[PDB]
Design a protein around this ligand. Sequence first.
Ligand code: THP
Ligand code: CA
Length: 132
Amino acid sequence: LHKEPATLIKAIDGDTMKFMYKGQPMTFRLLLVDTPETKHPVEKYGPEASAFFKKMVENAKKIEVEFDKGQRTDKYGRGLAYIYADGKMVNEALVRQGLAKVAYVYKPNNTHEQHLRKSEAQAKKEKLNIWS
Ligand SMILES: Cc1cn([C@H]2C[C@H](OP(=O)(O)O)[C@@H](COP(=O)(O)O)O2)c(=O)[nH]c1=O
Ligand SMILES: [Ca+2]
């Protein structure tokens, strides 16, 4: 896997964002996680997850996207990646706070699954947010 740059245009919710990627605006969706819903007809921790994601990506010097080994987009045309803000994976950061659950684990895009599950298990043991 490799990391590629991208530019933040807008944070949408806990797990979806608009990026300028190779000079074209594109929606991206975090791999392997689900933040609580705030759009579709509001789940507990949805606004909290959304705020955490927004703050982490808005404050970054450098944003990178890392595709996994399979599909790079989902059926809605969203890019599927691990997103890094100054080298810190946002997917893991949300899970580690109990603001997302490991979810949507679709092979072959499961490279960081165990890493994320370990963070989830720590958030759960610490009784954080969704696990509280
Ligand atoms: C994270 C992810 C979501 N999806 C799809 C599954 C869900 O489709 P359906 O909407 O048809 O259920 C939706 C979950 O995204 P959201 O959590 O943004 O709604 O996006 C993928 O196909 N691949 C992925 O890797
Ligand atoms: Ca979601």
